[PDB]
Swiss-Prot record, chain B:
UniProt xrefs under SMART domains: Proteasome_A_N
Name this protein carries in UniProt: Proteasome subunit alpha type-2
Record-linked Gene3D superfamilies: Glutamine Phosphoribosylpyrophosphate, subunit 1, domain 1
Crosslinked residue numbers (Glycyl lysine isopeptide (Lys-Gly) (interchain with G-Cter in ubiquitin)): 108
Additional remarks: Present with 7060 molecules/cell in log phase SD medium.
One Gene Ontology cellular component annotation held by this UniProt entry: proteasome complex
Keywords: Cytoplasm, Isopeptide bond, Nucleus, Proteasome, Ubl conjugation
Native organism taxonomy: Eukaryota, Fungi, Dikarya, Ascomycota, Saccharomycotina
PROSITE patterns: PROTEASOME_ALPHA_1, PROTEASOME_ALPHA_2
Record's function text: The proteasome degrades poly-ubiquitinated proteins in the cytoplasm and in the nucleus. It is essential for the regulated turnover of proteins and for the removal of misfolded proteins. The proteasome is a multicatalytic proteinase complex that is characterized by its ability to cleave peptides with Arg, Phe, Tyr, Leu, and Glu adjacent to the leaving group at neutral or slightly basic pH. It has an ATP-dependent proteolytic activity.
Complex and partners: The 26S proteasome consists of a 20S proteasome core and two 19S regulatory subunits. The 20S proteasome core is composed of 28 subunits that are arranged in four stacked rings, resulting in a barrel-shaped structure. The two end rings are each formed by seven alpha subunits, and the two central rings are each formed by seven beta subunits. The catalytic chamber with the active sites is on the inside of the barrel.
Location (main, coarse): cytoplasm
Subcellular location: Cytoplasm; Nucleus
Swiss-Prot record, chain E:
The keyword Chloroplast belongs to this UniProt entry's keyword annotation: no
GO terms classed as biological process: proteasomal ubiquitin-independent protein catabolic process; proteasome-mediated ubiquitin-dependent protein catabolic process
Matches recorded under SMART domains: Proteasome_A_N
Lineage: Eukaryota, Fungi, Dikarya, Ascomycota, Saccharomycotina
Similarity comment: Belongs to the peptidase T1A family.
Name of the protein described by the UniProt record: Proteasome subunit alpha type-4
Record's keyword terms, sorted: Cytoplasm, Nucleus, Phosphoprotein, Proteasome
Chief site of localization: cytoplasm
Residues with Phosphothreonine modification: 58
UniProtKB/Swiss-Prot annotation, chain F:
Entry function: Non-catalytic component of the proteasome which degrades poly-ubiquitinated proteins in the cytoplasm and in the nucleus. It is essential for the regulated turnover of proteins and for the removal of misfolded proteins. The proteasome is a multicatalytic proteinase complex that is characterized by its ability to cleave peptides with Arg, Phe, Tyr, Leu, and Glu adjacent to the leaving group at neutral or slightly basic pH. It has an ATP-dependent proteolytic activity.
Location(s), subcellular: Cytoplasm; Nucleus
UniProt keyword list: Cytoplasm, Nucleus, Proteasome
Protein known as: Proteasome subunit beta type-6
Single GO biological process annotation from the record: proteasomal ubiquitin-independent protein catabolic process
Residues of the full protein shown: 20 to 130 of 241
Organism: Saccharomyces cerevisiae (strain ATCC 204508 / S288c)
Curated annotation (Swiss-Prot), chain I:
Position(s), cross-link Glycyl lysine isopeptide (Lys-Gly) (interchain with G-Cter in ubiquitin): 188
PROSITE patterns: PROTEASOME_ALPHA_1 (PS00388), PROTEASOME_ALPHA_2 (PS51475)
SUPFAM superfamilies for the chain: N-terminal nucleophile aminohydrolases (Ntn hydrolases)
GO CC terms, sorted: nucleus; proteasome complex; proteasome core complex, alpha-subunit complex; proteasome storage granule
Major location category of this protein: cytoplasm
Protein name per its UniProtKB record: Proteasome subunit alpha type-6
Native organism: Saccharomyces cerevisiae (strain ATCC 204508 / S288c) (Baker's yeast)
Higher taxonomy: Eukaryota, Fungi, Dikarya, Ascomycota, Saccharomycotina
Keywords attached to this entry: Cytoplasm, Isopeptide bond, Nucleus, Phosphoprotein, Proteasome, Ubl conjugation
InterPro entries per record: Ntn_hydrolases_N, Proteasome_alpha, Proteasome_alpha-type, Proteasome_asu_N, Proteasome_sua/b
Gene: PRE5
Residues where Phosphoserine is found: 11
């Protein structure tokens, strides 16, 4: 785990997530996909404690998929984010809390608007034009404060994202083995293979 | 051992009747008459004190009960069932309202909680329904004065005036002739005493009649001074002497 | 009404006796034990021709060395098989060995009387449990909803049981080959079945020390049916 | 009707027929007695010898609770054992909390409340035994008899079983002839006589006698069985009186 | 807790509560399943004593358990929701642990197991429901159709019907369905299904529902006009 | 604070031949610098030609041997007097030990 | 034991019917009629109070029509006490959904869960079913205006217009006659009142024996308003359509 | 007709099990009586010991519930003792919880509430007993409060219970018509006991020896029963007047 | 009649019919015999088959090294009760390092059977047991009935036609009680005892079941060719 980013532009939400899985002094894997599709127009990235992350992600995924089958309908990104927040808000006072931080990128088909939600392990939810978890934010937020505009295209967003990854590859202590980038828009979720 | 009666003892018959509820209403019919009348500035509830023996002290048996400082209750039917309902009703006014909001519940909601308790005795395992109909009079800031009837089924209805029990049919007709929307509290007490005399057979005085009002705040009955917002209970039980004073100008 | 665990005046449990009647309505199942193996065979009995007969599963594996056939309310057998499989695998986990056929049967029979006012009624299905172990060799057991089990050299259960059992009394000897036993199950099934016996409405299986428990293909059984018809015509 | 089919149901008389039916099971059982004496109590019981194959002295029916209380009963023997098992639990918890061994009246109510509880619900059956029991405590000797309903009283002498009326008559004579009191050793002899006299109501099978006693002087306040020379002496006394 | 053993054996060896649950199925609206060479079709009757219905919002007779499996039923409507809900939950749980959607046989085996449990558990009555479960196993093109009933028994069918007058439509299917050559196309399979319902239904208006399931999570429900074209075509060939 | 474990010392040794096997152990039992016993055996015949020793904390050692001896008894009861093979005994003892994974038997066991 | 006194409320008849459910429906058929009519621009809920007394307090009264949330209401037919148990459960369920998803609960989801509770009382627990039938009237942004009904069996269905309680057979025929799809709210108000006026067991339909409610988008722009009619407002609407 | 076997309503709104429990009350064939003095409350009851083999000292239907409260029972002894043990436990708990001695009327209400539950809950039968509680309450003074299987309870100027209760009741009524007061205007409890026995003799029409009666007396801060010789002393005093 | 629906109901004459019906299941069971001397205690049991293709239902069960029983009636109920005895014998060994007295074994079975006759929902056990053992007071023989009644005897028999063996043992009492230090002769007496309960069938090699426990003999069961000596 470690690096997860998110940018909301005019017509889409873009999520970038690091590929490394490190345990001790060894990088065990350099192609890890730190994301789960919750519904056709909703994607969740995650970072935190080993085991906890995937277990929580897949548990949420199962619940949203169950809802989709029951009602023959897709929950709004706002609705999914509120469900996820409440699960984490329950968790934080459990015997063993989930130590997982998530970003939820979705396209609301009823509003025709992209939406990005940042939620930490405590259950702290905020809607943002751009978001990050962990130490990544300490570099990317100020960068995006400067270069981000609300009316950008998906291509402009990807260039803005390249600028973030470059900065992290220059100033971060650890080798996070690049990022997997995914786009969420009116047509659903797709992966950029060459980043 | 253990309660093996986990199943309903009240069930639907082919005709659609709920037998035990009907039979409970029959027990209420046998019960002694009680009534309630709503005035513009108060509410009166009354009943006959049927003594079991002249050696019995009928003051020790209270048919009219305070539930909250602004709410009172009276009944027709089975006394023991009423007594435990009053205990439960007083407690639920605290647990499910006062301990949450720091004030007493309005009449309609307390009534609603009592109704719930009676409904559950109609559906839960190994129990019979309550054999009583209640009349609950009360006041609260945003609804003013009100009067409610609660039946064994758990149903409740608001009334301008009504009667329940032995001679309810005749008493309700008497109240229809006398009730108007301009009745002052004293006029309602007068009509309550007139209506009750019809159903009472033996002695008719302050020792055989039990009567209480929901009216003005009583600062003298509060027990303390120093808080301007606390002005005293609106529930007051009329004394044996106070009843006899009104029986002369009858 | 009356208690579920009530005794009759003759000293029998009503519900157990009534479940035995349900088993008599069930489809026939036959088992024969030899020194070369144990054979299990059943009547499928499809209720309609549109029903795909190969989805009728009345012979079932418990472990590699133990198999099972059923007769009666077959839906009741699912949890019995589930328990049997768990019992067999659990014993292997705890003791690093195969569990004895008799011990398995006893474990299944312990479920039987766990009903009353535990489940609400006895099982409405009888089981034929066949297997092999190193101590007592090839074995066949009949497990009832009474909680009782008998070891058998041969045994039939279901609607055609009493007629088939009388036939098994005459035909069985201590020197039967596996092939001889296979033909004998087919022969006796064909005798008690309503519809004409073929590879689609009857199923064979066996358990041997060497190859374990195997359900036969429809192609393999069809040839044994043909071999049986030819041998009866040959004298 | 149908009022007698379920335990804890009142009949129109105000009776619990199921308890009265349990009493019939008690009346069917063998005779047992209790005699209160100067400084203690004596218990005796009739043991029917069904066959030569019964090992003599080896099917003991009288039971001890704690170290100072003795219990005997008539009716369904297993029901009596269940009651004693509870008695032993009750006596153990009393001694645990309060140190002193349970007083006899205290012990009597413990059994009484427990038996009474088995008349309160339809999901349990009443006890099929009347139990005679007692011992010695700080206030002297006490003898009690408890019935299926839960009813118990203190007794000068007590009897139950098939020969209860015969035994009761014989007991009443002792109370009249000895107003000052009966000694422990005398009561043992009398107990033997009364069991032999009460055996006339059960005389097909011959029987085996079993006696026990608690006495402040003779057994130091503890429950003991009567055996050997003292038993044979009590048997001979009884044999001489029937002839 | 309520403990009563409601499903028990009778002297003749029958469990009447299970058998009476089958009568509730016999009262329910007819349902039929027919599987072709490359598809399964589920047809359902809807009674017409109910006009002024709102068909947009009224619960549909065929339910998706997952994107690749469907379930139709005959019997008590309220009872069926409980089975459908449990099936939908097990579908998601299987995907979570095995990392593969359920096979139609497995999903059927689960639903049948639930039904069986309600026949020997204290304090409960059996489900007054028989189900038709159809679909395609993951990465498989062989059509699957299964049937369950209150007792708990389940089995595979080339074609099958349940509900009121099901014995009439089963008769039709038994002579009109060739095992050697199942309906080669979607059109052929839908037609044979509509034909079989027309033996029992009444008018081919808003009385028949048809749902077609094809491989790889390809499920669609036909509209009134689409079904009405099958009804119109069949009647014109009949007048001969 | 109460410490539920102790160390009773001693040592044990097992060797296997072609048609035999030995299991040896000293008979000394200790706590700290004191001798509790000069002869307190800790190698036991458990039946079915299985010998066993659980060395370390004697209270746990005795408890384990006691439970395994009892396991052999119930194996006979439940499986028609079948002899418990050494390999089966080993697997059974694993489950006895791991059953207390989060409050272990403080012993080194040899059979 | 206690087996003797068990009615066995959750069993089948030899014909495959649930005794208690059937008998509960028989009870409901004597309750005051309640009607729901769904128009293109709103929904009407109309209900007849059970034989009134002149000394009943009419304004501070609620018997038939209850508010579940700001977008959903129900008309009741059966035991009022039973209905209030279920209404409070429904109210809580609506708030649970809002707390979880930050969106008002879709009407069908609420109706399904309430109906699922009724179903449970017919399959397990040995208790009597709830003697209640509901008409649900509500709005959400998926299906817009919706009418549903549920009964003691736990079965629910959707409707354009429907009646529950007494004289449903006669009421349904009259609604089936005069209802059309392009209908407006004010027309539906008239149809609801006219139907009750003809099916009533009383001599004449008056303001004091009715409860009335509308769910319109007749607020200001793209939002829904619930109007539980006051006594005087029912008196006026009864004059405006010329029934009195 | 299973509505007569458990505590559910009959078509006419009655509870037959409760009514039959009232009939069990008289199964012992014993009559009880209670009266109030200025300083005391006296209760008396008949004592019938038929069997010669019984220890007469152990035969009693009067119970010391607490130091201040006494209770006499009309009904079978098993149910009587059941009620007594519960009353003792309830009075003890009250004192521990609330820091003062349980009043006679409050204990009566509590036992009445318990009885009420048995009339509503099916698995529990009513106790076939009528409980008369007596004390000298520190607030209300001399007190008599009585409970029955229906769960009914009320205070009394005086009371009587048993098969021949009506005779005793009217006898007492006629005395209080004459005296014009609520109690026995007497200083000592000894004479209030004498009044109680005298008026029981007149109403029942029988004479009593020392072993035919049982007496309980409540004064301020203690309730106690009388011995055979205490009663004999009391019987002698009546005879010499 | 009206009073046999469950065990919680007494009849008007004070009988428990469900307990009596359980007793009836024992009478239908195959005969088994028990007898003892001062040194040894012996069980002999006639086993029953379903037909000639089936096995013979085992009647004897070992409880400890010094104790065991034989059964007649519902076999699963004997399994439950023997399993309870195995645990109680075992508890005594582990906790008190004490072999459970045969008498206490009887008291424990009595109290377990009794609880099933006083509560709603349950049923009585439908099996009778003959328990033999050798403890600190020598050899013992017990008879268990599911009414709860347990009885210590020199010899006895239960099952169908058990009256024949019970009479024989009553005659032979003085002889077989003094067969001390001779196992084979005590068995011979038990085999002759069970022979008085046979009709049309005789004792064969896969029909007879014998068990013995004593001073220098653990509880051991003999079947098959090991009982050929005694035919
Ligand atoms: Cl209380």
């Amino acid at each position: 785990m470690d690096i997860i980013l998110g940018i909301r532009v005019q017509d889409s939400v873009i999520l970038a997530s690091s590929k490394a899985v490190t345990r001790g002094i060894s990088v065990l894997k350099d192609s890890d996909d730190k994301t789960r599709q919750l519904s056709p127009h909703t994607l969740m990235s995650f970072a935190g404690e080993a085991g906890d992350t995937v277990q929580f992600a897949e548990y949420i995924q199962a619940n949203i998929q169950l809802y989709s089958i029951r009602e023959d309908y897709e929950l709004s990104p706002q609705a999914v984010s509120s469900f996820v927040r409440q699960e984490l808000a329950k968790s934080i006072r459990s015997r063993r809390p989930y130590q997982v931080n998530v970003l939820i990128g979705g396209y609301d088909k009823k509003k025709n608007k992209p939406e990005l939600y940042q939620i930490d392990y405590l259950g702290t939810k905020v809607e943002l034009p751009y978001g990050a978890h962990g130490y990544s934010g300490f570099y990317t937020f100020s960068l995006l404060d400067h270069h981000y505009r609300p009316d950008m295209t998906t291509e402009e967003g990807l260039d803005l994202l390249k600028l973030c990854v470059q900065e992290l590859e220059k100033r971060m202590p650890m080798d996070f083995k690049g990022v997997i980038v995914k786009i969420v828009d009116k047509d659903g979720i797709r992966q950029v293979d060459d980043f | 051992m253990t309660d093996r009666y986990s199943f309903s003892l009240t069930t639907f018959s082919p005709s659609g009747k709920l037998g035990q509820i009907d039979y409970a209403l029959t027990a209420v019919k046998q019960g002694v008459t009680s009534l309630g009348i709503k005035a513009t500035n108060g509410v009166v509830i009354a009943t006959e004190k049927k003594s079991s023996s002249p050696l019995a002290m009928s003051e020790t048996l209270s048919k009219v009960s305070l539930l909250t400082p602004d709410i009172g209750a009276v009944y027709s039917g089975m006394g023991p069932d009423y007594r435990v309902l009053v205990d439960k009703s007083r407690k639920v006014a605290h647990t499910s309202y006062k301990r949450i909001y720091g004030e007493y519940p309005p009449t309609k909601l307390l009534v609603s909680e009592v109704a719930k308790i009676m409904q559950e005795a109609t559906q839960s395992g190994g129990v019979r329904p309550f054999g009583v109909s209640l009349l609950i009079a009360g006041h609260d800031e945003f609804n003013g004065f009100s009067l409610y009837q609660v039946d064994p089924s758990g149903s409740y209805f608001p009334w301008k005036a009504t009667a329940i029990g032995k001679g309810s049919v005749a008493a309700k007709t008497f109240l229809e002739k006398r009730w108007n929307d301009e009745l002052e509290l004293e006029d309602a007490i007068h009509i309550a005493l007139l209506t009750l005399k019809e159903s009472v057979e033996g002695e008719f005085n302050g020792d055989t009649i039990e009567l209480a009002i929901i009216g003005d705040e009583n600062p003298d009955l509060l027990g303390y001074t120093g808080i301007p917002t606390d002005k005293g209970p609106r529930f007051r039980k009329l004394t044996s002497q106070e009843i006899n004073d009104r029986l002369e100008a009858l | 009404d009356r208690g579920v665990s009530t005794f009759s005046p003759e000293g029998r449990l009503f519900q157990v006796e009534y479940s035995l009647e349900a088993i008599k309505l069930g489809s026939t199942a036959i088992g024969i034990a030899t020194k070369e193996g144990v054979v299990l065979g059943v009547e499928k009995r499809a209720t309609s021709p549109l029903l795909e007969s190969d989805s009728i599963e009345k012979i079932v594996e418990i472990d590699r060395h133990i198999g099972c056939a059923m007769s009666g309310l077959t839906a009741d057998a699912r949890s019995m098989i589930e328990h049997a499989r768990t019992a067999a695998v659990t014993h292997n986990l705890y003791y690093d060995e195969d569990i004895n056929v008799e011990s398995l049967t006893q474990s299944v029979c312990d479920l039987a009387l766990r009903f009353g006012e535990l489940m609400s009624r006895p099982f409405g299905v009888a089981l034929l449990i066949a297997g092999h172990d190193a101590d007592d060799g090839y074995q066949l057991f009949h497990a009832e909803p009474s909680g009782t089990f008998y070891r058998y050299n041969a045994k039939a259960i279901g609607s055609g049981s009493e007629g088939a059992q009388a036939e098994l009394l005459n035909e069985w000897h201590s020197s039967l080959t596996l092939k001889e036993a296979e033909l004998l199950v087919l022969k006796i099934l064909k005798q008690v079945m309503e519809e004409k016996l073929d590879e689609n409405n009857a199923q064979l299986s066996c358990i041997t020390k060497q190859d374990g428990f195997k359900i036969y293909d429809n192609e393999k059984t069809a040839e044994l049916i043909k071999e049986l018809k030819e041998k009866e015509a040959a004298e | 009707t149908g009022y007698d089919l379920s335990n804890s149901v009142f009949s129109p008389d105000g009776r619990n027929f199921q308890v009265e039916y349990a009493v019939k099971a008690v009346e069917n059982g063998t005779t047992s007695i209790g005699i209160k004496c100067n400084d203690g109590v004596v218990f005796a019981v009739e043991k029917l010898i069904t066959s030569k194959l019964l090992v003599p002295q080896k099917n003991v029916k009288i039971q001890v609770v704690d170290r100072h209380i003795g219990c005997v009963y008539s009716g369904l023997i297993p029901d009596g054992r269940h009651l004693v098992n509870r008695g032993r639990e009750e006596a153990a918890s009393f001694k645990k909390l309060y140190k002193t061994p349970i007083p006899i009246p205290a012990f009597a109510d413990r059994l009484g409340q427990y038996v009474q509880a088995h008349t309160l619900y339809n999901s349990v059956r009443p006890f099929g035994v009347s139990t005679i029991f007692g011992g010695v405590d700080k206030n002297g000797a006490h003898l009690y008899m408890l019935e299926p309903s839960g009813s118990y009283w203190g007794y000068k002498g007590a009897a139950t079983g098939k020969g209860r009326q015969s035994a009761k008559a014989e007991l009443e004579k002792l109370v009249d002839h000895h107003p000052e009191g009966l000694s422990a050793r005398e009561a043992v002899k009398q107990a033997a006589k009364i069991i032999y006299l009460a055996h006339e109501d059960n005389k097909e099978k011959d029987f085996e006698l079993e006696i026990s006693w608690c006495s402040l002087s003779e057994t130091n306040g503890l429950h003991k069985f009567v055996k050997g020379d003292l038993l044979q002496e009590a048997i001979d006394f009884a044999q001489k009186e029937i002839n | 807790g309520y403990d009563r053993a409601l499903s028990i054996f009778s002297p003749d060896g029958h469990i009447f509560q299970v058998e009476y649950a089958l009568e509730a199925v016999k009262r329910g609206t007819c349902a039929v399943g027919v599987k072709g060479k490359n598809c399964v079709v589920l047809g359902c009757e809807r009674r017409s004593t109910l006009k002024l219905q709102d068909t947009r919002i009224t619960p549909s007779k065929v339910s998706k358990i997952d994107s690749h499996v469907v379930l139709s039923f005959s019997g008590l409507n309220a009872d069926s929701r409980i089975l459908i809900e449990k099936a939908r939950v097990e579908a998601q749980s299987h995907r979570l642990t095995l990392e593969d959607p359920v096979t139609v046989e497995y999903l059927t085996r689960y639903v049948a197991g639930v039904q069986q449990r309600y026949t020997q558990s204290g304090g409960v009555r059996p489900f007054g429901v028989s189900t038709l479960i159809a679909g395609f196993d993951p990465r498989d093109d062989e059509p699957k159709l299964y049937q369950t009933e209150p007792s708990g028994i389940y089995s595979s069918w080339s074609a099958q019907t349940i509900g009121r007058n099901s014995k009439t439509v089963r008769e039709f299917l038994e002579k009109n369905y060739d095992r050697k050559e199942p309906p080669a196309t979607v059109e052929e399979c839908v037609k044979l299904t509509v034909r079989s319902l027309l033996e029992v239904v009444q008018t081919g208006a808003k009385n028949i529902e048809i749902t077609v399931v094809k491989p790889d999570s390809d499920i669609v429900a036909l509209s009134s006009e689409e079904i009405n074209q099958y009804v119109t075509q069949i009647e014109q060939e009949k007048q001969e | 604070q109460f410490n539920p474990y102790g160390d009773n010392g001693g040592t044990i040794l097992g060797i296997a031949g072609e048609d035999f096997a030995v299991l040896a152990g000293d008979t000394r039992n200790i706590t700290d610098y004191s001798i509790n016993s000069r002869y307190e055996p800790k190698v036991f015949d458990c039946g079915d030609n299985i010998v066993m020793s659980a060395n370390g904390f004697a209270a746990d050692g005795d408890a384990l041997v006691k439970r395994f001896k009892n396991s052999v008894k119930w194996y006979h009861f439940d499986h028609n007097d079948k002899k418990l093979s050494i390999n089966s005994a080993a697997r059974n003892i694993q489950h006895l030990l791991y059953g207390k994974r989060f409050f272990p038997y403080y012993v080194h066991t040899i059979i | 034991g206690s087996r003797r006194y068990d009615s066995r409320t959750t069993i089948f008849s030899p014909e495959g019917r649930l005794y208690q459910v059937e008998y509960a429906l028989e009870s409901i058929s004597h309750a005051g009629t309640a009607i729901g009519i769904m128009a293109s621009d709103g929904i009407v809920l109309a209900a007849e109070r059970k034989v009134t007394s002149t000394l009943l307090e009419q304004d501070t009264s609620t018997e038939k029509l209850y508010k579940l949330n700001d977008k959903i209401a129900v008309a009741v037919a059966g035991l009022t006490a039973d209905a209030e148990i279920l209404i409070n459960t429904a109210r809580i369920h609506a708030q649970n959904y809002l707390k979880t998803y930050n969106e008002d609960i879709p009407v069908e989801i609420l109706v399904r869960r309430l109906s699922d509770i009724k179903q449970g009382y017919t399959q397990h627990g040995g208790l009597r079913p709830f003697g209640v039938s509901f008409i649900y009237a509500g709005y959400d942004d998926r299906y817009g205006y919706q009418l549903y009904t549920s009964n003691p069996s736990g079965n629910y269905t959707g409707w354009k217009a429907i009646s529950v309680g007494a004289n449903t057979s006669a009421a349904q025929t009259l609604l089936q006659m005069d209802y059309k799809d392009d209908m407006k709210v004010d027309d539906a108000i008239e149809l609801a009142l006219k139907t009750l006026s003809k099916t009533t067991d009383s001599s004449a339909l008056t303001y004091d024996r009715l409860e009335f409610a509308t769910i319109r988008k007749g607020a200001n722009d793209g939002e829904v308003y619930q109007k539980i009619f006051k006594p005087q407002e029912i008196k006026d609407i009864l004059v405006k359509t010329g029934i009195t | 007709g299973y509505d007569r076997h458990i505590t559910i309503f009959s078509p006419e709104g009655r509870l037959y099990q409760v009514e039959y429990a009232f009939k069990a009350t008289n199964q012992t064939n014993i009559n009880s009586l209670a009266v109030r003095g200025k300083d005391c409350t006296v209760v008396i009851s008949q004592k019938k010991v038929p069997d010669k083999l019984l220890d007469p000292t152990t035969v009693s239907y009067i119970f010391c519930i607490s130091r201040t409260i006494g209770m006499v029972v009309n009904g079978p002894i098993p149910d009587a003792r059941n009620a007594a043990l519960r009353a003792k436990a309830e009075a003890a708990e009250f004192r521990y919880k609330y820091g003062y001695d349980m009043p006679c009327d409050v204990l009566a209400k509590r036992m009445a509430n318990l009885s009420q539950i048995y009339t509503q809950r099916a698995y529990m039968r009513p106790l076939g007993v009528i409980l008369t509680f007596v004390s000298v309450d520190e607030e209300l003074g001399p007190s008599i409060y009585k409970t029955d299987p229906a769960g009914y309870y009320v205070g009394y100027k005086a009371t009587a219970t048993g098969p021949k209760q009506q005779e005793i009741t009217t006898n007492l009524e006629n005395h209080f018509k004459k005296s014009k007061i609520d109690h026995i205007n007497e200083e000592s409890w000894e004479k209030v006991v004498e009044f109680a026995i005298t008026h029981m003799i007149d109403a029942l029409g029988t004479e009593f020896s020392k072993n035919d009666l049982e007496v309980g007396v409540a004064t301020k801060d203690k309730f106690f029963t009388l011995s055979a010789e205490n009663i004999e002393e009391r019987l002698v005093a009546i005879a010499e007047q | 009649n009206n009073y046999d629906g469950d065990t919680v109901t007494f009849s008007p004459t004070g009988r428990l019919f469900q307990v009596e019906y359980a007793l009836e299941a024992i009478k239908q069971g195959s005969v088994t015999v028990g007898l003892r001397s001062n040194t040894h205690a012996v069980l002999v049991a006639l086993k029953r088959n379903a037909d000639e293709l089936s096995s013979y239902q085992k009647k004897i069960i070992k409880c400890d090294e010094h104790m065991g029983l034989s059964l007649a009636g519902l076999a699963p109920d004997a399994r439950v009760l023997s399993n309870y005895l195995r645990q109680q014998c075992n508890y005594s060994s582990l906790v008190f390092n004490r072999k459970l007295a045969v008498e206490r074994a009887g008291h424990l079975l009595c109290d377990k059977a009794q609880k099933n006759t006083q509560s709603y929902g349950g049923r009585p056990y439908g099996v009778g047991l003959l328990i033999i053992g050798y403890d600190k007071s020598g050899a013992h023989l017990l008879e268990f009935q599911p009414s709860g009644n347990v009885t210590e005897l020199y010899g006895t028999a239960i099952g169908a036609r058990s009256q024949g063996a019970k009479t024989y043992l009553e005659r032979t009492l003085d002889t077989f009680i003094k067969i001390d230090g001779n196992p084979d002769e005590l068995i011979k007496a038990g085999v002759e005892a069970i022979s008085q309960s046979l009709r049309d069938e005789s004792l064969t090699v896969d029909n007879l079941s014998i068990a013995i426990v004593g001073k220098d003999t653990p509880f051991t069961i003999y079947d098959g060719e090991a009982v050929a000596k005694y035919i």
